[PDB]
Structure 1
Amino acid sequence: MNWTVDIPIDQLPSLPPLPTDLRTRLDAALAKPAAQQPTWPADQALAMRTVLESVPPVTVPSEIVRLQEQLAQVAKGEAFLLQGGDCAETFMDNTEPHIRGNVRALLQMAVVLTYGASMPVVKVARIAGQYAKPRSADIDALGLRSYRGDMINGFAPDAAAREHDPSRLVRAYANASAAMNLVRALTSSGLASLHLVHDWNREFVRTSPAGARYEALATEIDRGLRFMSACGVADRNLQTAEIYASHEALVLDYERAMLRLSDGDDGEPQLFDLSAHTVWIGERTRQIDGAHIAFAQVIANPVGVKLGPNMTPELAVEYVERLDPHNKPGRLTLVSRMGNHKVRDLLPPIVEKVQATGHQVIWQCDPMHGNTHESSTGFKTRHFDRIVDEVQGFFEVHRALGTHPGGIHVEITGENVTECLGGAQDISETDLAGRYETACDPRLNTQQSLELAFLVAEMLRD
């Protein structure tokens, strides 16, 4: 009588274990200390991991190999990386309309960035697994154990909901696989048709308060599309697009259980994390001798590491030597998150020192996480202008060094939320209370996220 349904779990499948040699390596890596982990019983975690070891994967190795090839092109300055989605996915909002809205928002941004960059845009959603977060404080403002994301505990402000529940590992997988199934369906459908997506962009221009500002570029894009059609271009590639899946690799119980061995028809068999295509390590879990970095070493997926204002050029180089030991362009993405007031100063010496190693990382801008403040109305928020300005500074840093501004990583949604201040809608502190729906950080709403794409497209054209 709690209005919840229990779904029984079975670990019946008989599947061979991972090879002894790879397990031996994995065990040695996971013996390292791991920050920010859930505190549930080991016996229960083991049982859940055992279930997840036998489930169909979310992604397959050939997709990850294909992504790696596309990311190598980004690292070489021949493509641009767009990564975006919810700050925190919730099980409650993991619905068709919400997923479709986020996929749509990403695609809308991508066509604008493609035109502005004059090169392919690799589209990576924060989706199908972004269910876990780190917490700075053990006790939140309400005197409760902190919400850690839906893979660990519940958002609701009650004690029972905040207890760490290892059954969530399986609920997370169910939600991730369901979302990924839909993302695949949507991208191979008309939704990712280039003409349809740009029609939405055209509507945005009509009805945005600053639409006059973006009308020139929008018209130019439309004339570019029309030109393709006029040139008799095969329409086949226009109809569908590839959207990859990503999340912060935080809960090692989940990530380790989703490891699979590739079939070895591409090269040599090895460990892939098939919970996603690519994952990144967060600022609070990137300890150089910690388990997260060690885990990222062992897997074959492309990986990223968040770099905040305390980053040194020397530590950045250590990440490069640990995580890109074979010098594979695009294998490693370094995600700069410095604050708009600091990026121009702190980023250049890191870029210089890393470039001198001879490795080719992707330099990606996260203009969100270094630009967060609390409004006077109590809401955790970010100003659009500061977000835009960090990307601007990021481009200036790279332009001065002759290096590639390789992409952005943003928190966005297709919803008309009121979470970030500013944009052409001029969202105010007062407005924030209307639709502040994020379970964690403030997201750019659908209009703000498209406006950012127009602005970044202009930076690319400069």
Structure 2
Amino acid sequence: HSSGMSWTVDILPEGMQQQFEDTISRDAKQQPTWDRAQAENVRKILESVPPIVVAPEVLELKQKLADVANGKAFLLQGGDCAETFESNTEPHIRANVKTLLQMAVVLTYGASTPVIKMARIAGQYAKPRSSDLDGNGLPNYRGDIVNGVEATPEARRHDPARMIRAYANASAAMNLVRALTSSGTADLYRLSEWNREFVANSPAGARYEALAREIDSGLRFMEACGVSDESLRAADIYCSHEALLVDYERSMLRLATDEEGNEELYDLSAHQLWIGERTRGMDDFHVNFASMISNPIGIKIGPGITPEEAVAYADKLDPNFEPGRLTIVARMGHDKVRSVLPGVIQAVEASGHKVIWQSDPMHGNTFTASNGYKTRHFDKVIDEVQGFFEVHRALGTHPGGIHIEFTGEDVTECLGGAEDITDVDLPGRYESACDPRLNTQQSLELAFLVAEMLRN
């Protein structure tokens, strides 16, 4: 048959369309309120443009996140709470990229494993808000993809054309991220030089001296052993953001066919996407959208989550039991993390799912100070990661990664650190469009401390 049959042969997909109609018809929290005609037309435009990432990149990330999930790698994710178009500039993107690469060197030494580097970037332009308004019946700022920061009626109108502004800014940002990471900014030795200066100039320099020396001897040892710096002159930074805005994420859906012929649906606005605390209703748009796209997925779970719910998300979002497909992002508060997480981890591990366990120590530890500035204390941010680690060592499970909001700018947004920031310091350089970020120094201090947690 085989030789006969060989010469004879020589002479909108159907399942997806079901799931996609299901998903689009679900309720969607935290949406804008804009003209349906204008919206559709902007999606039509954005359905044809170059995506922000390509599918094989997403397949490579999935392989890396599977290593994380299996105890063989660590996930560092972070950047601005909210990107803005005004701030989406070379110096600022460079400032954050460096900070994250710098943190990653220290964490790699501490984990003794690769660190996967995921920036909050190239699309983090929507934010959840408690009401549609409330100051004076004037619309609340929902991020630069919906409306403007300016506190006026014209600026606060929900504008669908801002989805194109956002795509363009995203594109530019990813272009630069890629360019920097391939042209010398992610050089291991240049980054270690930057860490060495951080230590030398910190008022808490002596807290880090000895780990910093030890890392340094590690680097010099490679070079002594005759290692060519082929692997060491660059690195991959991946983009991520909260999949929030319905109209934008659907307009970036792309079909991708791999090498073994298999057709998949990707949201190619980013490598990785996550579902917020406020939008994770199990019958709602966001969870079901994430369930039908092949991108790796994150989910934010707060201190009210039960183990039963943890498992059901895991079943919804990881139904084919793929290590690292799904990342469970605990943001519980420093005082709740040691109570709540153990039970969550135990039920989920037992259900045969192998997720990445990630600590978001920012969003459970936010408060409003005497002077009315939203802030977070460094000690409480640190204590939640520390407790996260404690839980993992007690259960024998893998502390998968961290998700932190930071910038490479010398801001005064979070209290504490070596610079000893207090209530009165906060209005000096408070620059965030949304939540209080760790500044450059606090970010580096935190990487050294999470390095010590990993070494234990």
**What amino acid sits opposite 1:265 in the alignment?**
E
Secondary structure, counterpart of 2:319 in structure 1: coil
What is the DSSP-based 3-state SS (H/G/I as helix, E as strand, rest coil) of the residue aligned with 2:364?
coil
Cross-structure match for 2:197: 203
Alignment partner, residue 235 of structure 1: 229
Q: Deviations over 1:192-246 (max 9, x none)?
A: 0000001000000011110111011111111100101111012101000000000
How far does the alpha carbon of each residue in 1:379-438 deviate from its partner, in whole angstroms, 9 at most, with x for none?
000000000000000000010000011000000000001000011111111110011000
Alignment match, 1:186? 180
1:88 aligns with 2:82: yes
How much does 1:27 deviate?
A: 1.5
The aligned counterpart of 1:307 is 301
Instruction: Give 1:266 deviation, angstroms.
Output: 4.6
Aligned to 1:10: none
Kindly report which structure 2 residues correspond to 1:298-447, keeping only aligned pairs within 5 A, or say none.
298-447=292-441
- CA distance in 2: counterparts of 1:19 and 1:154, whole angstroms: 38
Measure, in 2, the Cα distance between the counterparts of 1:20 and 1:165.
Answer: 34
How far 1:152 moved relative to its partner?
0.5
Provide the rounded CA distance (Å) in 2 between the counterparts of 1:79 and 1:406.
8
Alpha-carbon distance in 2 for matches of 1:177, 1:211: 38
In the alignment, is the contact (CA less than 8 A) between 1:151 and 1:172 conserved in 2?
Answer: yes
**Cα deviation code 1:315-342 (max 9, x no counterpart):** 1111000110000000000000000011
Distance 2:13 2:313 in 1: 27
What does residue 155 of structure 1 align with?
Answer: 149
Partner of 1:110: 104
Task: Measure the CA separation in 1 of the matches of 2:171 and 2:134.
Answer: 31
Unmatched segments (≥5 aa) in structure 1: 1-17
1:254 equivalent to 2:264? Answer: no
1:39 aligns with one of 33, 36, 41: 33
- Cα separation, 2, equivalents of 1:145 and 1:266: 49
SS in 2 for 1:433: coil
Give 1:19 deviation, angstroms.
Answer: 3.7
Q: Could you report, residue by residue, the CA deviation over 1:295-330 in whole angstroms, capped at 9, with x for unpaired residues? A: 001100000100001101011111000110000000
Which whole-Å CA distance do the structure 1 matches of 2:260 and 2:433 have between them?
40
Match of 2:133 in 1: 139
Q: How many Å separate the matches in 2 of 1:400 and 1:291?
A: 36
1:118, 1:309 → 2: CA distance? 31
Q: Following TM superposition, by how much is the alpha carbon of 1:143 offset from its aligned partner in structure 2, in angstroms?
A: 5.2
Cα distance, 1:263 vs structure 2: 2.8
45-54 or 26-35, which moves further after superposition?
Answer: 26-35
Q: Give 2:201's aligned amino acid.
A: T
Q: What is the alpha-carbon distance in structure 1 between the residues aligned to residue 396 and residue 253 of structure 2?
A: 38
Task: Please tell me whether the aligned partners of residues 86 and 126 of structure 1 are also in contact (alpha carbons under 8 angstroms).
Answer: yes
Instruction: Provide the C-alpha distance between the structure 1 equivalents of 2:116 and 2:137, rounded to a whole number of angstroms.
Output: 43
| 2:442 corresponds to 1:448 | yes
- TM-score norm. by structure 1 comes to 0.95
> Equivalents in 2 of 1:376, 1:217: separation in Å?
37
Q: Is the 8 A contact 1:373 1:380 kept in 2?
A: yes
Q: Deviations over 1:78-137 (max 9, x none)?
A: 000000100000000000000000000000100000000100000000000000011112
CA distance in 1, matches of 2:35, 2:209: 57
The superposition leaves residues 165-201 of structure 1 with CA deviations (integer Å, 9 ceiling, x where unpaired) of 0000000000000000000000001110000001000
Amino acid in the other structure paired with 2:203: P
User: Does the CA contact (< 8 Å) of 1:30 and 1:294 recur in 2?
Assistant: no
1:165 counterpart = 2:159: yes
Say which of 93, 96, 119 aligns to 1:125: 119
Is the Cα contact below 8 Å between 1:112 and 1:221 reproduced in 2? yes
> How many residues are treated as equivalent by the alignment?
445
The Cα shift of 1:144 comes to 2.8
Contact 1:307/1:337 (<8 A) preserved = yes
| Counterpart check, 1:52 vs 2:46 | yes
Task: Determine the structure 2 residue equivalent to 1:13.
Answer: none
Cα distance change of structure 1 residues 421 and 287 upon mapping to structure 2, 3 Å threshold? same
CA distance in 2, matches of 1:428, 1:39: 39
- Counterpart of 2:289 in 1: which secondary structure? helix
CA distance in 2 between partners of 1:226 and 1:62 (Å):
35
Percent identity between the two aligned chains: 66
CA deviations 1:141-176 (Å, max 9, x no partner) are 465311100010111111111110000000000000
Q: Name the aligned partner's letter for residue 191 of structure 1.
A: T
Residue 460 of structure 1: CA displacement?
A: 0.6
> 1:133·1:149 contact (CA, 8 Å) conserved in 2?
yes
Moved more, 152-161 or 87-96: 152-161
Separation (CA, whole Å) in 2 of partners of 1:227 and 1:296: 44
* Structure 1 residue 277 corresponds to structure 2 residue 275: no
**TM-aligned CA deviation for residue 20 of structure 1:** 5.5
AA of the residue aligned to 2:162 = R
Provide the secondary structure at the position in 1 that maps to 2:116.
Answer: strand
Aligned: 1:264 with 2:258 = yes
Query: Residues of 1 paired with 2:106 and 2:83: CA distance?
Result: 25
Counterpart CA distance in 1 for 2:138 and 2:380 is: 32
Q: Which amino acid counterpart does residue 118 of structure 1 have in structure 2? A: S
| Distance across 1 between alignment mates of 2:317 and 2:99 | 31
Q: Calculate the TM-score normalised by the size of structure 2.
A: 0.96
Aligned-residue RMSD, C-alpha: 1.0
> Equivalents in 2 of 1:123, 1:460: separation in Å?
17
| Aligned twin of 1:295 | 289
Secondary structure of the 2:443 match is helix
Partners of 2:130 and 2:312 lie apart in 1 by 25
The aligned residue for residue 9 of structure 2 is: none
* Structure 1 residues 381 and 143: alpha-carbon distance in aligned structure 2, compared to 1, 3 A threshold: farther
Counting only pairs closer than 5 Å after superposition, residues 65-104 of structure 1 correspond to structure 2 as: 65-104=59-98
- 1:21: how far off? 4.7
Aligned amino acid, residue 116 of structure 1: G
Task: Tell me the equivalent position of 2:8.
Answer: none
CA distance in structure 1 between the partners assigned to 2:316 and 2:261 by the alignment: 22
Paired AA for residue 120 in structure 1: P
